[PDB]
Structure 1
């Protein structure tokens, strides 16, 4: 075990920027930030000699190409590759081996990585960093810190092998679908890159240039026998697949290619020209026949954008009058409110703040409207949004409560996300790009965002912001003139 380890053996690293740039572009679509960061890394390493190894993490929805882009980076840089599923782990021993006192004790897994790669400047991937239990007899995060410290990593040693080994030239990648649960000490030490979903156009491009040939090769097929139209892929994306990722699209394309291969072997068509008419037999029938859960937004229900752990979503904040408005015409009782959605205490406080603001705003605008003051109401804000992004539904909550008070439905194909501050001031929120792609995928044409988030919508591409009559606000009153124009 000691001898098989490389010692001073550094894998030759690619340094030409154009070549690695082209490799990354041909192995992947989009991901401009990741490719630019790798180009900066190569430029630094070529401008400072020794092949330093920098740490970073890729945060984004699944089925986006994090493992694939890391593999492409290992390929382009010419350095080796090795991954590790840290998710749900509770035994640090595998990273440190043992004390050597066991029967044939093994070293740490990084020792195995160095042995297999045979070189001391490899690419290492860590998947499900956010899923670490860090429970009893575990706490591997500390070891991870020991690994990811810019200075301590240089003297890393194992329980099995107490000799130190340099981990400064080793490049580290980490992948997660959310940035909150990952430990803060581990969070700070490494930078954080956003690979954020795809719209139908990006998914179609990825499928036609990366998924279809890949699965044809997987199914032992050629570009002539199995033919898929871009229209077929678009229809599949719209109806057979509803998420920000690409994984389910991969499953469907693999299924159709499997059926095509079977039809070629035992069937009659030496080659197949897949079309939607034939897509029905190749896959089945549309699963998501509805673009949205609602299309008119009746009174008391409003669309909102949620930055759930898996990309973005178009949730529907709903309200109902759960008691007769007039128990006693003289009665000056409080219009109690019930809230559902598995809400935390911060969510409950935000709902209370939105309730107070809605009452005040009605009293300012419709003083005779005692509906909100005197009515027992129930609002359901669907869960799924991360707790940090949850308070972004206050704007929805307010407009939905107003609509219920006056009965005026919110404007159709309208989505919003923002945070109220007990007076109407709308604050910036996170997950702007995921929410934008969700709204685009849901048919939203008008979108309301805080002014402070304007940039996170303007830094987006142009083909991701077509038909979105954006509405940038700082105070809630403006929205009342948008959601309720008349």
Structure 2
């Protein structure tokens, strides 16, 4: 069996990438759900709960500012698929941020696209460690594309055999992430139009 889906579109699920030990890449899928608070909490458990809190708090800033969803009155549940000892995750992981946006908006995410990077509270995608090793894991999982922070482009060093097996997509900002992974449609168009101001503000 496998804990990631390699093709198709799913709401609230993103193929993130992380490292186990010092150097081994893994596909680390994230599933998010948002609910009414019945003040909202970030609900997460385990070794990566701090990363979940970082990502959810940072994405909440951009959601409030640019989309106007009252995420402060929602509970946000973050699930990491596959428990591993010694996982090193991306600070403020963009995969978690993306899963939250997908969940709140009801817009499915392309499972063939893995991603790694850290979300700034301003909507920028900041560099992370282990990019080559994460890309390798994505290739071994049969994923088609991998989003990485633009500032990590020169960190990519793959074998000739692995090069060519995956499309590497460098990004500066969260809206480029959403452009590449969200399912095309009315909902996406509408959301992307709200995020345009983030791009205008950031350039």
TM-score range, shorter chain: 0.7 to 0.9
User: Aligned pair in 2 of structure 1 residues 297, 373: CA closer, same or farther (>3 Å)?
Assistant: farther
Equivalent position of 1:435 in the other structure: 134
Residue 362 of structure 1: CA displacement?
A: 2.3
Matched, 1:294 2:5: yes
* 1:464 to 1:399, Cα distance in 2 relative to 1, 3 A: same
Matched, 1:466 2:164: yes
SS in 2 for 1:415: strand
Secondary structure of the equivalent of 2:118?
coil
- Secondary structure of the structure 1 residue equivalent to 2:110: coil
Tell me the TM-score normalized by structure 1: 0.34
Q: Does 1:319 align with 2:20?
A: no
Task: State how far apart, in whole Å, the 1-side matches of 2:94 and 2:128 are.
Answer: 11
Query: SS of 1:424's equivalent?
Result: coil
SS of 1:434 mapped into structure 2? helix
What does residue range 23-422 of structure 1 map to in structure 2 within 5 Å?
288=1, 293-295=4-6, 296=8, 298-309=10-21, 311-321=24-34, 323=35, 325=36, 327=38, 334-343=39-48, 348=50, 350-367=51-68, 369-370=69-70, 372-382=71-81, 383-384=83-84, 386=86, 389-392=88-91, 394-422=93-121
Tell me if structure 1 keeps the 8 A contact 2:52–2:78: no
Contact 1:306 1:385 in 2 (8 A): no
The aligned counterpart of 1:188 is none
For the Cα contact (< 8 Å) 1:303–1:415, is it kept in 2? yes
Distance (whole Å) between structure 2 residues aligned to residue 454 and residue 311 of structure 1: 19
How big is the shift at 1:335? 2.0
Which of the two has greater strand per residue?
2
Number of the residue aligned with 2:195: none
Distance 1:298 1:351, change over 3 A: same
* Shift of residue 326, structure 1, vs aligned partner: 7.4
CA distance in 2: counterparts of 1:385 and 1:481, whole angstroms: 33
Tell me if 1:451 matches 2:164. Answer: no
> Matches of 2:170 and 2:136 in 1, distance apart?
17
5+ residue gaps, structure 1, are 1-287, 328-333
* Paired residues of 1:393 and 1:417 also in contact (CA < 8 A): no
Q: 1:444 Cα shift?
A: 0.9
Instruction: Find the aligned partners of 1:351 and 1:412 in 2 and give their Cα distance.
Output: 20
Q: Normalising by structure 2, what TM-score?
A: 0.76
Query: Does the Cα contact within 8 Å between 2:14 and 2:111 map onto a contact in 1?
Result: no
Are residues 393 and 416 of structure 1, via their aligned partners in 2, closer, same or farther at CA, if it must alter by over 3 Å? farther
Q: Distance in 1 between matches of 2:152 and 2:85?
A: 18
Q: Give the drift of 1:416.
A: 0.5
Shift of 1:454: 0.6
- Mapped partners of 2:153, 2:135: distance in 1: 12
- Structure 2 residue runs of 5 or longer lacking an equivalent are 189-203
1:313·1:438 contact (CA, 8 Å) conserved in 2? Answer: yes
Q: Deviation per CA, 1:194-221, whole angstroms, max 9, x where unpaired?
A: xxxxxxxxxxxxxxxxxxxxxxxxxxxx
CA contact (8 A) 1:307 1:385 kept: no
For residues 316 and 305 of structure 1, what CA distance do their matches in structure 2 show?
Answer: 8
Call closer, same or farther: CA 1:444–1:438 in 2, change over 3 Å: same
Report which structure shows greater RCO (CA 8 Å, sep ≥6).
Answer: 2
1:412–1:380: structure 2 CA closer, same or farther, 3 Å change rule? Answer: closer
Q: Deviations over 1:138-182 (max 9, x none)?
A: xxxxxxxxxxxxxxxxxxxxxxxxxxxxxxxxxxxxxxxxxxxxx
User: 1:477 pairs with 165, 175, 183, which one?
Assistant: 175
The alpha carbon displacement at 1:421 in A equals 2.8
